[PDB]
Design the sequence.
């Protein structure tokens, strides 16, 4: 039996403008062999993302402020995440379960 | 000021008992909307084969098992390759070493 469970979240975060999100992201479509997701690879303890609690290391970022991240470059995705703003809407994916091997 | 990232491949030859599992859990190998999730390591069982070996980590994307490129086979075939009864398994994985802080 193959199990897998997905939870796609809409995460509304209010912050100070010029406050960073406090997470580290990697992935995207920059390289020849891959169109990878944008992964959250670290979260800074006590930062915006950390205090919010909904997005954690291992989650995938799907959409930032209405823009689906498949439609823009990794550079542009980072640009969207870095936009000066006091609120940001992120859609993220949390994957659970899997096949034990 | 810099928003650099880096990812690196690694080849891991593991010797094990034919009766023992790898001691990890894999997910992905399926699409979500317009996203194709690669097969990756979602969990590692403390003290199992993969844990004791120490080279493959949670989050590693699995590229190739025993010569078979996983993008070229079904998800279930990927899982079957990993579960093969054998005393040695060769894995090629892709690890994100560095990302962009936002
Ligand atoms: Na690409």
Sequence:
């Amino acid at each position: 039996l193959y199990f897998q469970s997905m939870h796609e979240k809409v995460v509304n975060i209010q912050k100070d403008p010029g406050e960073s999100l406090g997470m580290t992201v990697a992935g995207g479509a920059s390289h020849r062999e891959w169109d990878l997701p944008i992964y959250v690879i670290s979260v800074e303890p006590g930062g915006v993302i950390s205090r919010d609690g909904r997005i954690k290391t291992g989650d995938i970022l799907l959409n930032v402020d209405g823009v689906e991240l498949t439609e823009v470059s990794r550079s542009e995705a980072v640009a969207l995440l870095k936009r000066t703003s006091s609120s940001i809407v992120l859609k993220a994916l949390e994957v659970k379960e899997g096949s034990i091997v």
About this structure: Chain B touches chain A at residues 3, 5, 7, 21-22, 24-28, 30, 32-38, 42-43, 58-59, 61, 75-76, 79, 82-83, 96, 98-102 (CB under 8 Å). Chain B has one domain: 1-102.
